[PDB]
Design a binder for this molecule. Structure first.
Ligand SMILES: Nc1ncnc2c1ncn2[C@@H]1O[C@H](COP(=O)(O)O)[C@@H](O)[C@H]1O
Ligand SMILES: Nc1ncnc2c1ncn2[C@@H]1O[C@H](COP(=O)(O)O)[C@@H](O)[C@H]1O
Ligand SMILES: Nc1ncnc2c1ncn2[C@@H]1O[C@H](COP(=O)(O)O)[C@@H](O)[C@H]1O
Ligand SMILES: Nc1ncnc2c1ncn2[C@@H]1O[C@H](COP(=O)(O)O)[C@@H](O)[C@H]1O
Ligand SMILES: [Cl-]
Ligand SMILES: [Cl-]
Ligand SMILES: [Cl-]
Ligand SMILES: [Cl-]
Ligand SMILES: [Cl-]
Ligand SMILES: [Cl-]
Ligand SMILES: [Cl-]
Ligand SMILES: [Cl-]
Ligand SMILES: [Cl-]
Ligand SMILES: [Cl-]
Ligand SMILES: [Cl-]
Ligand SMILES: [Cl-]
Ligand SMILES: [Cl-]
Ligand SMILES: [Cl-]
Ligand SMILES: [Cl-]
Ligand SMILES: [Cl-]
Ligand SMILES: [Cl-]
Ligand SMILES: [Cl-]
Ligand SMILES: [Cl-]
Ligand SMILES: [Cl-]
Ligand SMILES: [Cl-]
Ligand SMILES: [Cl-]
Ligand SMILES: [Cl-]
Ligand SMILES: [Mg+2]
Ligand SMILES: [Mg+2]
Ligand SMILES: [Mg+2]
Ligand SMILES: [Mg+2]
Ligand SMILES: [Mg+2]
Ligand SMILES: [Mg+2]
Ligand SMILES: [Mg+2]
Ligand SMILES: [Mg+2]
Lengths: 347, 345, 347, 346
């Protein structure tokens, strides 16, 4: 059959539960704990769905990550003993990209910008990105195809100016606060644009570019490739601009494995069957499937989504779920009622 | 009842609202009603469920769509056993009000929504088309106010329960001659009032959320709408009581030669032993599982109305489930399509 | 001197106090009481301002309306000893148009759309409109000068469609629910636009056109002339489109009394020195002063402003104040603390 | 008596300072972001018919060119003021300013920065020296129940009771500093969630006063002057705020060369501060009969939205609190510049 329509709704609960678990550790100074509980919650809720999924982006390779590892099967319909309870649509093989705790250190420090996020497409519909750095350009729909990752930041800012009908001084660029971005950040400043430096969480920044109202208009710089594919899935559905280019030269940015070599990384990519390492991927190439789903829920507060709030008698979450199938972007504001709360706030 | 049914109903109310909204201010209340009915029905029939309409547009051989007893959903057909699973094959009863406030839509006025409620078979009081005295109030007031108490005593109780003065209370009442004395009493008590021409469902549920500046609904409305309201209120833990009214001296249906003696007959032949019985919302929505869904057609207290813009549509729905024990506001941008601008709000 | 800068800020308190007073009568079924308290409160608060004001649009003529009548002097600096306790800027003569309770029946019924409103300019800076009907066309800044009040509703909708870059079906026109608008409403429906019929209060409707997010894009039809001037004041500061034209034909619309005639009205209009009654004015003409101020506060909830809320330990109001002098549109969300609230809500 | 319109005119003061500073968001110049805010604030203040003295500001006259301690601001400070100012405008008022609260937040384009000031009659505001200050901020419902001398653990228990919610349902803001290692661990051990900030404890303190911020207390050590400014706001809101001067470099160091506990003790005595270990509540930190507070977001924060530059204008959000009118005002201002074709409702 074809990807189950209700999947795009049911993923709301996946990210909600993952975020709620992770949020209990906000500012607790335990980044691995924040990450691990989100992983367990996401995996648990996904395994209760009537789907036949494979993790193509996750916590690591099979013998590195015990849960949500690359190649892991998730969903009721992956089980030999339960497959007969699944209908043809639910049996459709789908690939899944997960990032249960985007910004583990943001959560640990109780800082803004963290979220629980996943993306889905039919089998083979998501670029199974290796854990390499990725040069990224994110921009709003109005600039899609007009800006380009190969152009300089200055040129892109001028193009954004035209496309968004505002001055460069009236633009805001998000860049990760990293030494590798010193020249890039200086260039953006010299061009006249304002900047928001983030310590982590470039998935939220990228997607923020798509929505007029965030006062964020572009993401520039180098982040992680897997996160890039997840961002691209959202942008593909929203019609936003997103390009990525894999970085494999330790001179530009270091992977952190001693001792990394340009040829070393090159061989691995070749080994993974990646023919063109300098290849630039646009949005539709990183998320190329016929059906693309995206789900996110705020853990801590951010530009796109409110953080998880714990109050007397319940919890409140905010999620964004995007579906190419229904062609919708849904903001879900959920009050989770614990036990007969005497007061329920409208907002 | 399937866990995903509580999410699927989002699309049910969204599509009903969108269709009806296209007729905002067009002065056709039946048209606005009919396209909503059809859209809700069509979207329901795409769902893997075996549903039955227990509250709807009318009886079979009268109302063409969403009539009493109508089977809806995929699993109602033969053989569902082959196409849907045991959870999906479960029999559920459905109460619909596809266009609540048909004149509101026709006039482009606030307060209309597409609404429905669900439970297991037997889980919803299949209210007859009679009037119902209603009392809705916030969870803080649940069990403290009472429908049999006067407006004045209820206001005093509300004052204590909500820790605010009567002057700091707002009561919603339907603008009807039958409420002249009630409205006068509320005014004398010192509470502020919002009079509505139609749509007491939104008013009832608004009592449940702090921030609506609405704290109670009082008066007489339709019984079916009462049940749908009670479904939401039970999930939220809000106060809701209803009492059937069958005395034309108090209020008339419009049926020719309608008599109290006559109404009582009808009620009995319908299987209702005590027509003067007060039901709380747990009794009106008594099923193990209760679901409630609403989407704004025009702007209102709980939800924004439907907006059409260049490149799509935007809706706001409220979905409430006792199974997940959640209240979900769903703000959906319907991209149609490839819009160059997407607003955050 | 020039109109005092602080006057643009002081009028916040004027509309807030008028709206708060009026809101106490929400749903009481007394439209005159709701009107009178707003009138008195606005007047009282204006009389504490260091200004030299004259009412040019108000509740009626002296010897008829007791408060805020035509020609009434308001403000501390209208006193005979003014020069001694007022500075030059405070002594400038300003004309004031008031509508203390816009939508008295809305308040009486506890329905949406009522507000306390006023406009200010230097002496002569506001058209002292007579109490006649006025044909009006309101639209957003993007359509300014493109739509025209003399064009048909059908023509204007096509122009609006082009200007706002959306279809006619994606437009919302507000028209007063009146028998005089039967054909107009039908034409708008035929053209494919959606419609909001209002029972009262076309001031809010006109200004809503200027703000994206209101889902209101045009005001068409006939309303009261004085309300039109007040609306024109706001639209002038906002750059919105607003045209007015006096209507004095009893066959088109009647003022209700008595033995009224076009010829009779024509004489009265000549009597006030209104040469050309059929003259079409835009908002720059209706509010032609060098300085224009506009202030409004919601009484009941509406499209621009939230209504007045009374809660335990205070009151909450939302006002909109627009100044040509500071070139600002200010939404003022005020928590009035009746000491001392144990709980203060952020919103 | 203090002029009523002053409580409104300060909207423009913080707006102009915030707008000027916001132009430097993420531009890596904390000193520039700071300088322009200072200048815009002072320039705007000097257009006001007031008789003001700076009691909290950028530094001593020798060290700071603008908004220095003792500087006179406002039209009615001029020699001929009696001639052009009225009696209320002639009332001597003390002013505390922090034109750029979080200069590095702005330079890095991070959340939490504001332009802010506080006003009272002469002697109405504690003229805090630039020393560190132990602070405890909490909501009105907890006022007088929590206490700065109590441990974080007991205060959290008290907060739980007052705010009717579990300790796990509380969020405490703490500055991310080594001096707070133990304090943070204790809060974590008690079961509360934590938001660590790199700067901007004024915003964190005031956020405690408003339900909806999901922030319930501020604990730890910040700058004393900022504390006084925070107290003015909290005093007007009925929120809890206590401060205690810290002068022992063993706890926290000013960084000045050879600063010693006795050194600071000597300095405080010199300044006329009788008891350096005294605990002040916000009524004591802001003791004036009339208190005014004004803040405008520079970058986005929990309390206020940041400055947005768009095609045809700027948008700011400010909070202005007055004990005189007893009002808390949020001001959302679209600065049109000019003839913008599109004006967003929000
Ligand atoms: N034309 C406008 N009029 C008023 N406010 C605006 C306008 N454009 C942007 N804003 C404000 O700036 C925020 C960010 O806008 P944007 O930078 O386009 O994402 C919006 O959410 C509004 O608060
Ligand atoms: N304690 C409070 N402090 C500030 N504003 C409030 C408070 N209570 C209510 N409000 C305002 O009044 C609205 C309606 O409140 P309520 O009548 O409880 O629904 C809220 O959404 C706020 O805008
Ligand atoms: N391009 C868009 N994307 C998403 N929502 C929109 C868009 N345009 C308008 N809306 C929604 O419709 C409302 C009214 O828009 P408008 O008719 O332009 O005033 C907005 O406040 C949004 O909720
Ligand atoms: N009783 C409640 N019902 C629903 N949402 C709530 C409730 N209490 C708090 N929240 C949410 O949590 C946020 C912060 O709450 P608080 O920690 O009291 O500031 C609010 O703005 C709401 O979004
Ligand atoms: Cl499994
Ligand atoms: Cl942060
Ligand atoms: Cl990496
Ligand atoms: Cl698209
Ligand atoms: Cl792209
Ligand atoms: Cl859809
Ligand atoms: Cl419950
Ligand atoms: Cl059937
Ligand atoms: Cl109806
Ligand atoms: Cl009656
Ligand atoms: Cl009926
Ligand atoms: Cl007089
Ligand atoms: Cl006078
Ligand atoms: Cl009116
Ligand atoms: Cl004259
Ligand atoms: Cl006609
Ligand atoms: Cl009416
Ligand atoms: Cl009118
Ligand atoms: Cl203009
Ligand atoms: Cl014209
Ligand atoms: Cl003008
Ligand atoms: Cl409205
Ligand atoms: Cl630095
Ligand atoms: Mg992770
Ligand atoms: Mg990550
Ligand atoms: Mg219907
Ligand atoms: Mg109905
Ligand atoms: Mg009036
Ligand atoms: Mg009027
Ligand atoms: Mg400073
Ligand atoms: Mg500071």
């Amino acid at each position: 059959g074809s990807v189950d329509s209700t999947l795009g709704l049911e993923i709301i609960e996946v990210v909600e539960q993952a975020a709620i678990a992770s949020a209990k550790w906000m500012g607790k100074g335990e980044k691995n704990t924040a990450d691990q509980v989100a992983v367990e919650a996401m995996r648990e809720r996904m395994n209760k769905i009537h789907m036949r999924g494979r993790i193509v982006i996750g916590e690591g390779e099979r013998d590195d990550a015990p849960m949500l590892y690359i190649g892991e099967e998730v969903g009721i319909c992956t089980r030999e003993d339960a497959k007969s309870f699944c209908n043809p649509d639910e049996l459709v093989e789908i690939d899944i990209a997960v990032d249960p705790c985007e910004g583990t250190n943001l959560v640990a420090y109780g800082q803004n910008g963290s979220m629980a996020v996943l993306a889905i497409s039919e089998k083979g519909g998501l670029f199974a990105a290796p854990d390499f750095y990725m040069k990224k350009l994110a921009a709003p729909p109005a600039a899609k195809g007009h800006v380009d990752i190969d152009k300089s930041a200055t040129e892109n800012l001028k193009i954004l100016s035209d496309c968004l009908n505002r001055s460069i001084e009236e633009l805001v660029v998000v860049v990760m606060d990293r030494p590798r971005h010193k020249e890039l950040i200086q260039e953006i400043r010299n061009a006249g644009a304002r900047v928001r430096l983030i310590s982590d969480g470039d998935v939220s920044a990228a997607i923020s570019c798509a929505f007029s109202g965030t006062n964020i208009h572009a993401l520039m710089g180098i982040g992680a490739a897997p996160e890039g594919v997840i961002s691209a899935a959202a942008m593909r559905c929203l019609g936003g601009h997103f390009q990525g280019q894999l970085i494999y030269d330790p001179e530009v940015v270091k992977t952190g494995l001693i001792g990394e070599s340009r040829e070393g990384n090159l061989e691995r990519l070749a080994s993974m069957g990646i023919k063109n390492p300098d290849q630039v991927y646009n949005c539709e190439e990183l998320a190329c499937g016929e059906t693309v789903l995206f789900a996110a829920c705020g853990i801590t507060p951010g530009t796109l989504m409110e953080g998880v709030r714990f109050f007397h008698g319940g919890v409140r979450t905010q999620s964004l779920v995007i579906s190419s199938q229904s062609s919708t972007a849904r903001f879900v504001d959920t009050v989770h009622m614990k036990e007969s709360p005497k007061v329920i706030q409208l907002h």
